[PDB]
């Protein structure tokens, strides 16, 4: 049908200081690679351009009003932006970090069963949590406000309760085959 890239490649391939900056973001927020950072760079740039367009439209104009409100509402739903600010001027001031902080991984750190921004990502990818009664396997995700009230253990990781898989049973048989000697 139709497809599109979710990331962007900048015009200078080596730019040492920037490469370091990008590595630091990866460290802080537990990411896979530069493509993860580029993924946010693509989204953020489009949001700023959206904002900037609206801001140069005439005031009290249906298009500016309707799409303004929509852009604001979306950014507040995911908890990047706060609605005590709530106009175009403030949206421009947002940066890469503000998005990353509202991801599933960084919530799984902040509460629950991760010990690091390391651990968290591996926990999500190995299906140790449900967000509600719904497993989430994607760490780069961005949870909404009231979805951070339902992050909890899964019933398909058998610690935190759940049906025995073959990893709990593996540990059982280090006591009944490792120490059972058979």
């Amino acid at each position: 049908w139709v497809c599109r890239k979710t990331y962007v490649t900048p015009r200078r391939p080596f730019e040492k200081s920037r490469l370091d900056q990008e590595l630091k973001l990866i460290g802080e927020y537990g990411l896979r690679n530069k493509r993860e950072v580029w993924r946010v760079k693509f989204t953020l740039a489009k949001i700023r351009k959206a904002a900037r367009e609206l801001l140069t439209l005439d005031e009290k104009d249906p298009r500016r009003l309707f799409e303004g409100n929509a852009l604001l509402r979306r950014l507040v739903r995911i908890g990047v932006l706060d609605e005590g600010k709530m106009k175009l001027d403030y949206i421009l001031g947002l940066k890469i970090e503000d998005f990353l902080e509202r991801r599933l991984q960084t919530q799984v750190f902040k509460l629950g069963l991760a010990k690091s921004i390391h651990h968290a990502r591996v926990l999500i990818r190995q299906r140790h949590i449900r967000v509600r009664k719904q497993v989430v396997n994607i760490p780069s995700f961005i949870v909404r406000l009231d979805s951070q009230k339902h992050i909890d253990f899964s019933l398909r990781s058998p610690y935190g309760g759940g049906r025995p898989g073959r990893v709990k049973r593996k540990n059982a048989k280090k006591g009944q085959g490792g120490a059972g000697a058979g």
Partner: protein, 131 residues
């Protein structure tokens, strides 16, 4: 185990003589008890017997514990047989389509073109090559 059939979007369909509904089956951790089980289970709800009940669709929901499908219950077997898509009949065997199949019919059709009259002749002409 611990199922319950919860019926969204219920329709009384008087003009195809059937109760048409979504089948929403919650499960404890494993998605999907059998199609045959669902028809039995449903059968004593509407009291129609499972043999006028067809059930189709079905798609497991990630991390288990739910499966949404679709069911139809025909008031009589006659009504079922009369709206009747072949795939639905096929789905749990009790009738399946043609098994001739296909390229035999095409060969036969090409034999008929050759001559005018004499039906049996062209059948025998299609029948000698197997090749």
């Amino acid at each position: 185990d611990t199922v319950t059939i919860r019926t969204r979007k219920f329709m009384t369909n008087r003009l195809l003589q059937r109760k048409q509904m979504v089948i929403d089956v919650l499960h404890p951790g494993k998605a999907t008890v059998p199609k045959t089980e669902i028809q039995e289970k449903l059968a004593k709800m509407y009291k129609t017997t499972p043999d006028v009940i067809f059930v189709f669709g079905f798609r497991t929901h990630f991390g288990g514990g739910k499966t949404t499908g679709f069911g139809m219950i025909y008031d009589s077997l006659d009504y079922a047989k009369k709206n009747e898509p072949k795939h639905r009949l096929a789905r749990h065997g009790l009738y399946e389509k043609k098994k001739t199949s296909r390229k035999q019919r095409k060969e036969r059709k090409n034999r008929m073109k050759k001559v005018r009259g004499t039906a049996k002749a062209n059948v025998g002409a299609g029948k000698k090559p197997k090749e």
